[PDB]
Amino acid sequence: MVLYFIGLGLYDERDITVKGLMIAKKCDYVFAEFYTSLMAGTTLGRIQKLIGKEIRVLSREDVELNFENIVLPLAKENDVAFLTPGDPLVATTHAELRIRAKRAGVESYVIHAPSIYSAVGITGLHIYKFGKSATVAYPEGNWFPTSYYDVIKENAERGLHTLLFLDIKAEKRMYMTANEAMELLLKVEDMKKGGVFTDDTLVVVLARAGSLNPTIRAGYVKDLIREDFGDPPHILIVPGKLHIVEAEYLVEIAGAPREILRVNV
């Protein structure tokens, strides 16, 4: 009679932690959502096969409006698990569902998994140098989001890197590429003209983190905006000013132009 929030990891069913697998195997009911992120290297079937249960997938509305009607009831009796891509609380509002659990007299526990937030370390950029993060959202009708642009400006001021989560509309199977995010930003720069993001800005693209062969690329926008980085998910990072070893890693591992070697301290 408790509820488990269990992360599934970055790419496939194997990025779950052993702790999560053995507990998931012993739960009576298993729920999940696949709208907060995209696990490009697996299927619901493989997850079900690995865990040895039938996973009922929930929609954003089932979760955000009916979590306490669909999932919480069974927890008061049974052991229930709620699976999510990556880490269950990172760049989601699932944390709030812990509070709902509490108000219904249900104990909840969290089992972490590898998250895109810490996986940026594979880019060679010191993770402690990351500043405030932001999400590049798809424009809707007449409304064109731009806050993420200011975030980059603020962090870059301070010499900090900026992590940009990319938008996703899972029900429509839409996953914003880095390419797409770079376009929106040029438009925003063109609209605000702050010299934040231009054809000469250095950016880093990390695609399908968690797989064994993720795409990691660093370079100027003019060069990258049209390059193919493979299937989603992608994220895009706008570094601040670089340490020498960061630049060496970017050149050596991420194929950046050798001349970012030359840092302008």
Ligand X SMILES: Nc1ncnc2c1ncn2[C@@H]1O[C@H](CSCC[C@H](N)C(=O)O)[C@@H](O)[C@H]1O
Sites of contact with ligand X (CB under 6 A): 10-11, 36-37, 85-87, 90-92, 115-118, 165-166, 168, 206-210, 233-235
For the chain, after which residues does the C atom lie more than 2.5 Å from the next written residue's N, i.e. where is it broken? none
List, in order, residues 6 or more apart from 78 with CB less than 8 Å away. 1, 27, 28, 29
Among 61, 77, 199, 252, binds a copy of itself (CB under 8 A): 252
Using CB under 8 A, which residues numbered 130 to 189 contact a copy of itself?
A: 130-135, 154, 158, 160, 165
CA distances from 90 to 6, 86, 150, 154 (A): 12, 8, 22, 22
Using CB under 8 A, which residues numbered 110 to 129 contact a copy of itself?
A: 110-115, 117-119, 121-122, 124, 126-129
CA distance 145 to 163: 17
- As measured in angstroms, the least distance from the Cβ of 95 to a copy of itself is 4
CA distance 109 to 4: 5
254 binds, among ligand X, a copy of itself, none (CB under 5 to 8 A by kind): none
Is residue 10 a known part of a binding site?
A: yes
> Two tokens at 77?
């009796």
Find out whether 88 and 6 touch, Cβ atoms under 8 Å.
yes
| Contact range with a copy of itself by CB under 8 A, out of 64-72, 170-178, 219-227, 240-248 | 240-248
Is residue 136 a known part of a binding site?
A: no
> Two tokens at 105?
């007299």
CA distance 50 to 47: 5
User: Is 45 a residue that touches a copy of itself (CB under 8 A)?
Assistant: no
Using CB under 8 A, which residues numbered 209 to 228 contact a copy of itself?
A: 209-210, 212-213
CA distance 200 to 219: 9
- As measured in angstroms, the least distance from the Cβ of 176 to a copy of itself is 16
Q: With respect to a copy of itself, which residue has the nearer C-beta, 135 or 225?
A: 135
187 binds, among ligand X, a copy of itself, none (CB under 5 to 8 A by kind): none
Q: With respect to ligand X, which residue has the nearer C-beta, 172 or 262?
A: 172
In the three-class reduction of DSSP (H, G, I as helix; E, B as strand; rest coil), residue 132 is classed as coil
β-bridge pairing 134-136 and 215-220 = unpaired
Nearest to 174 by CA among 38, 33, 9: 38
219 binds, among ligand X, a copy of itself, none (CB under 5 to 8 A by kind): none
Place of tokens 């929930």: 58
Q: With respect to ligand X, which residue has the nearer C-beta, 37 or 155?
A: 37
Give residues in contact with a copy of itself (CB under 8 A). Answer: 7, 9-10, 12-19, 21-22, 50, 86-96, 98-99, 102-103, 109-115, 117-119, 121-122, 124, 126-135, 154, 158, 160, 165, 209-210, 212-213, 245-246, 248-249, 252-253
